[PDB]
């Protein structure tokens, strides 16, 4: 069984120690030839690499070009997010822009959103650089923390980015997982990932790409999109609800085998009319996923306690019937 973390503390020390001394090259990628980008990536990596849990996010400045590009994408998205987009995005985005300060003139930092989520939703942000493995990111995603980056795309290609950047997640990921239901949804994916074999690691990752990154929802009669990648690109949004790509009902097992493509638009999509349907299907998927154990999340200490003995089930119990005891007061004092 591959080693997996149990507390947020070792999510920091070892996954940054196993990933020490590793810069991003991306030379052959579009752009990334300007020296200023390399200097920025150095500063971006330095803040991310030596960051420790519990510490506030070190605020990073933003010069003229990034905000000027941030003008372009942010202005284009609000005029188009009013259509084609999921309903939960709308009141969230309005809630984000009025409180957190999602505006064209001011580029948002990471501390303000990080404070904003755990105030309501419970997700923390975390800077990172280099090549994110599949296992390190799911371990973070398991603990109700979303791994993130603070640098943005290249000014040469503001319409699309070779790799997900800051604006990709603060506009595609962050608005989505601020939801009560999807956060519980997103957490379930991470929960099944604890100690899963490499073959299984691919499966839910494809599901994560096929549900969180590109997912369709059916509410108010019409179909809408809630994918992170869907709500992070301009041309994708036009293609997403267009009649060219093939759209089918979501299926955990089916989405775990179907392949992908890169640098091109996606022609395959999965739709879930309700996030309740979304949870309880990969819920059944995790049921058939064999493991020598299971995993329980403790929100009182933000840790993971392993489950290979019926005894380990015990120190979860008095908490479980605790509410069913505390439900007495609420359902006694009432009336």
């Amino acid at each position: 069984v591959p080693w997996f973390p149990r507390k947020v503390s070792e999510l920091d020390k070892c996954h940054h120690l196993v990933t020490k001394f590793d810069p991003d090259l991306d030379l052959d990628h579009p752009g990334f030839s300007d020296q200023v980008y390399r200097q920025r990536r150095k500063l971006i990596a330095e803040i991310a690499f030596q960051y420790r849990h519990g510490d506030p996010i070190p605020r990073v400045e933003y010069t003229a070009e990034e905000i000027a590009t941030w003008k372009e994408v942010y202005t284009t998205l609000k005029g188009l997010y009013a259509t084609h987009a999921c309903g939960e995005h709308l009141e969230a985005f309005a809630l984000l822009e009025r409180f957190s300060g999602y505006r064209e003139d001011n580029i948002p930092q990471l501390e303000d959103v990080s404070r904003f989520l755990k105030e309501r939703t419970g997700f923390q942000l975390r800077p990172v650089a280099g090549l994110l493995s599949a296992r390190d990111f799911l371990a973070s995603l398991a603990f109700r923390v979303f791994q993130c980056t603070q640098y943005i795309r290249h000014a040469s290609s503001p319409m699309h980015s070779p790799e997900p950047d800051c604006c990709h997640e603060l506009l595609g990921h962050v608005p989505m997982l601020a939801d009560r239901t999807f956060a519980q949804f997103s957490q379930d994916i991470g929960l099944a990932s604890l100690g899963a074999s490499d073959e299984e690691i691919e499966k839910l990752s494809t599901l994560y790409w096929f549900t969180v990154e590109f997912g369709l929802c059916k509410q108010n009669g019409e179909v809408k999109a809630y994918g992170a990648g869907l709500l992070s690109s301009y041309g994708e949004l036009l293609h997403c609800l267009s009649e060219e790509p093939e759209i089918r009902a979501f299926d955990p097992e089916a989405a775990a085998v179907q392949p992908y493509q890169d640098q091109t638009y996606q022609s395959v999509y999965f739709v879930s009319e309700s996030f309740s349907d979304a949870k309880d299907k990969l819920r059944s998927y995790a049921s058939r996923i064999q493991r020598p154990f299971s995993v329980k999340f403790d929100p009182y200490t933000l840790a993971i306690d392993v489950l290979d003995s019926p005894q380990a089930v015990r120190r979860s119990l008095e908490g479980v019937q605790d509410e069913l005891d505390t439900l007495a007061h609420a359902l006694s004092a009432i009336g």
């Binding site: 493995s133 599949a134 296992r135 790799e163 990752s205 890169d262």
Partner: peptide, 18 residues
Amino acid sequence: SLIEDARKEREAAVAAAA
């Protein structure tokens, strides 16, 4: 490209095993 990030896992994983 996260599927490719799954596709990067195993040859490095199995060649380490191999």
